[PDB]
Amino acid sequence: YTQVFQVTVSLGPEDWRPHSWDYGWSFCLAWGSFTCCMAASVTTLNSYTK
């Protein structure tokens, strides 16, 4: 969807082309959802070793 967003700004979307492109803000918070899927997994495989 960033590949969607970058290509469509290269289209200059039909009348809404911004001089922004300031991403998110919850999409930056969506990036923290990935590491909180990773920090959840490192402790539950830590219980798996024993």
Binding site: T2, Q3, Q6
Partner: peptide, 29 residues
Amino acid sequence: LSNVAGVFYILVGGLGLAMLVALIEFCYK
């Protein structure tokens, strides 16, 4: 960024290989 996102498919396609070789080892278990 556009040259770098098509190469994610060989990453995730390898990630699908990570379980299929592992799950048959559970059949080896």
